[PDB]
């Protein structure tokens, strides 16, 4: 009879004396002061940690956590790698427009589509554009820019587009969020009010992952290529039959790919090995490097490594892996002639003041873990205006009306009648009537 604080629930079926039990940290301890373990880390009694929306506590060698429902996340990345809302990795290489997510599941309020095209000569395909239908408005993410289309006359469901780090973030007041890295990666986040009322390549988000392969006609299949083929949009698009194997069709490119992608398994990421399993990212890195055989193959690799570095940051391991010879980043390009304010933030853990949050506007998600270059505005004009990427005084930032920036003083355009508008010299947008009939 020798308990150890880790065989507590085992049963002791098959040193410390009677009573006290080994804790794994040192001398014997009573059951009450028995510590807790998590991801190869040993926490004493009465500690605190957070898991993605909640907070926990090591009570009696056991964790007690709050119960709130975190958001739901779907991931699209690489040459056709998908992660659904309930955590089911898979691959699919199509050439058509596919329903990423939607609410018209057998009347609906939105839809998010994607556009996959071939990239390479081995047959693999990758995403290169996004379309967002909200009510009647249609946003399109394309050519590193956001384009509005068919803006509805007077409903104009409130959204917000901005740029954080290297990523472009589009949020909707209803509870939809899209994060786009401008090349191939996409994250879709949904609020917990949509639970079990969506369908598409990202599953139906019901905390149950044995039914995410539901086809368009409400049938559960067991094949990736049948689930994928049933969500194409144009009926004339062809059907996928087999998944190509890049590194087998391009033998001469293997040696390089297996050598560069090996950094994930090196000692550089030694801190993150106990928190995120690197194998499903190493496989994606090798798969992507063997396929980009028509040019610009140093860009397929850096994004693949960044996808894993971002998760390491998200779980609490800020790692600095870029070097002047490995995926360099050119930040100070944005600085004024020779005043140094923009800095490469390896893991984005910085909360500064913009002219949006200065007026009480706040988001609903923490995006404090995105890589990129960030400002460090000086002390003579410390408010970061986003639509121009400029450090300005608290007075002269902008107005931000109808998702359009307007410089202070500038006559604010208005799609109303008899209503002129101006951005005051106090960052305040104010409108007046004109009796030229109509009145106030």
């Amino acid at each position: 009879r020798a308990l150890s604080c880790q065989t507590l629930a085992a049963g002791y079926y098959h040193v410390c004396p009677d009573g006290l039990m080994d804790d794994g940290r040192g001398g014997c301890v009573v059951e009450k002061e028995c510590p807790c373990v998590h991801n190869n880390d040993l926490y004493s009694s009465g500690a605190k940690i957070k898991v993605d929306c909640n907070t926990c506590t090591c009570k009696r060698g056991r964790w007690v956590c709050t119960q709130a429902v975190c958001h739901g996340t779907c991931s699209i990345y690489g040459s056709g790698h998908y992660i659904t809302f309930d955590g089911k990795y898979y691959d699919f290489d199509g050439h058509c427009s596919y329903v990423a997510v939607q609410d018209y599941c057998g009347l609906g309020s939105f839809s998010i589509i994607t556009e996959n095209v071939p990239c390479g000569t081995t047959g693999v395909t990758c995403s290169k554009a996004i379309k967002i239908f909200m009510g009647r408005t249609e946003l399109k993410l394309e050519d590193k820019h956001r384009v509005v289309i068919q803006r509805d006359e007077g409903h104009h469901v409130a959204y917000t587009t901005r740029e954080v780090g290297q990523y472009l973030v589009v949020e909707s007041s209803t509870g939809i969020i899209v994060i786009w890295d401008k090349r191939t990666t996409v994250f879709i986040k949904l609020a917990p009010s949509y639970k079990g009322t969506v369908c598409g390549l990202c599953g139906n988000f019901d905390h149950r992952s044995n039914n995410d392969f539901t086809t368009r006609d409400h049938m559960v299949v067991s094949s990736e290529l049948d689930f994928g083929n049933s969500w194409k949009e144009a009926p004339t698009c062809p059907d996928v039959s087999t998944n190509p194997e890049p590194c087998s069709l391009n033998p001469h490119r293997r040696s390089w790919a297996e050598k560069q992608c090996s950094i994930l398994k090196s000692s550089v990421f030694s801190i993150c090995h106990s928190k995120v399993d690197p194998k499903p990212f190493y496989e994606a890195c090798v798969h992507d490097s063997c396929s980009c055989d028509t040019g610009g193959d140093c860009e397929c690799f850096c994004s693949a490594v960044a996808s894993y570095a971002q998760e390491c940051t998200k779980e609490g391991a800020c790692v600095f892996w870029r070097t002047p010879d490995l995926c360099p980043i050119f930040c100070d390009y944005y600085n004024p002639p020779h005043e140094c304010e923009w800095h490469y933030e390896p893991c984005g853990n910085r909360s500064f003041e913009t002219c949006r949050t200065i007026n009480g506007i706040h988001s609903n998600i923490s995006v404090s873990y995105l890589e990129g270059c960030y400002p460090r505005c000086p002390k003579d004009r410390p408010i970061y205006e986003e639509d121009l990427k400029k450090c300005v005084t608290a007075d002269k930032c902008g107005c931000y009306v109808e998702d359009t920036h307007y410089p202070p003083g500038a006559s604010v355009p208005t799609e109303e009648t008899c209503k002129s508008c101006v951005c005051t010299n106090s960052s305040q947008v104010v409108c007046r009537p004109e009796e030229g009939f109509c009145y106030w």
């Binding site: 020798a2 308990l3 150890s4 880790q6 065989t7 507590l8 629930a9 085992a10 049963g11 002791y12 079926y13 098959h14 080994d22 807790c36 373990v37 998590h38 991801n39 190869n40 898991v51 926990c56 060698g61 056991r62 964790w63 007690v64 956590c65 309930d86 955590g87 089911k88 018209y104 057998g106 009347l107 609906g108 839809s111 239908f133 249609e138 289309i149 068919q150 905390h207 149950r208 992952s209 044995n210 368009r216 006609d217 409400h218 049938m219 559960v220 067991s222 049948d226 949009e233 009926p235 398994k265 090995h273 106990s274 928190k275 995120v276 399993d277 690197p278 194998k279 779980e315």
Partner: protein, 473 residues
Amino acid sequence: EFSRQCSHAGGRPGNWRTATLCPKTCPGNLVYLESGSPCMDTCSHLEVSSLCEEHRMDGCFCPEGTVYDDIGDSGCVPVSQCHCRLHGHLYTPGQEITNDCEQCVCNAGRWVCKDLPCPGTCALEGGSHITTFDGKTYTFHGDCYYVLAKGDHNDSYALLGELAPCGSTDKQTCLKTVVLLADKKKNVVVFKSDGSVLLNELQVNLPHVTASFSVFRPSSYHIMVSMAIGVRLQVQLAPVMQLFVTLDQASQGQVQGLCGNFNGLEGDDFKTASGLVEATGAGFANTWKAQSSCHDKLDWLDDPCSLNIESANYAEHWCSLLKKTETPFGRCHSAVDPAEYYKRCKYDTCNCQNNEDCLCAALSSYARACTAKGVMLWGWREHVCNKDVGSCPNSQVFLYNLTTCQQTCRSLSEADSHCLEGFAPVDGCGCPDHTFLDEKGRCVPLAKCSCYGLYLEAGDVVRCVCRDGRLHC
């Protein structure tokens, strides 16, 4: 052209084409019109018009209702005639089907499905390859006793397993012994990897049927145990010890161990017994040690096919057979994807030091998963693992459908005491080819099987004359 300009500017012209004024025809009841939306509903892609980013022109369209038929080949048929499809065959609106764990009926265009009970299976294969009740494959390489699976209530049962180093390095492990704790943990049964099953530290004889559970040994290389609670066990003793556990569907969420919780979600499978979820495969496993004295292990971020170069060519040349469509395994390609089995075949063949034994053990796992979904691989031992196919005893021959109740004369004497169901057919030496196994040696014909008490020769009489197998008592 005037009409096209009329439509393009924003106007909507009316029909002018009559039967005598340049008419136009389309197949079926496709009526020609001007100024109608090209966004059509097609009996599969419904609600297209809500996402229509285009203006309208002329052409052949459908009436107000009667969405266009896409699955079939008719015209603008009504909505309540849409024929369903399922990997080919065109199912009519009213024809039913039964899928794996559910049954569906073709309603108007869309299936209506209803769940059916179907059990779950945990598998411990190879030296270290654990498949939970919800997939979630991972590799461990442990060294201790571990709690494979035990009923959570207080006592119901417990199933353990000895994972320990097997060759030279720590990275070559094996399963060495299976321990079962049942009957309120008042009975301990032990299976060692040499046969020699023993109960309460005492050797036992097979078959052994009791009130609570039972054990059988149909082919001398497979031990099959049934428990009245709803647990079923298969233990394979060659070429490498393996374990398969099957549970009913009335114990969903009441099991804990290395085999997960069996609740339908494969993300909380690594959920420790003390709250939060782990990230790696070794971190979660260490928390289920049955002996406090054992140490903790860590994952292994390497591929054995890169450390043993001389073995890589051998491993590839054979494990690649799984993807060859002309090979016997090519048949199974329709049902079960072979990619994971191929990768694990390479891993095991490169890693262990008995390369042929690991090759055969890995190759015999595909031919069990496939033989569970109907497709049965007949005669797949003709080139690869025929090392013992021809070694069967005098009248015995290697069979692929050697089930439990193809047994000797005494099995027919009762014929209903030990015919446990829900057990997959297994291979091995036998010959129940209407020649029922004799008391010993060659499998004699039905005429003189035996008269089973003791098994007498085919010349005795009780007045119940001794005859072929059965007795006219």
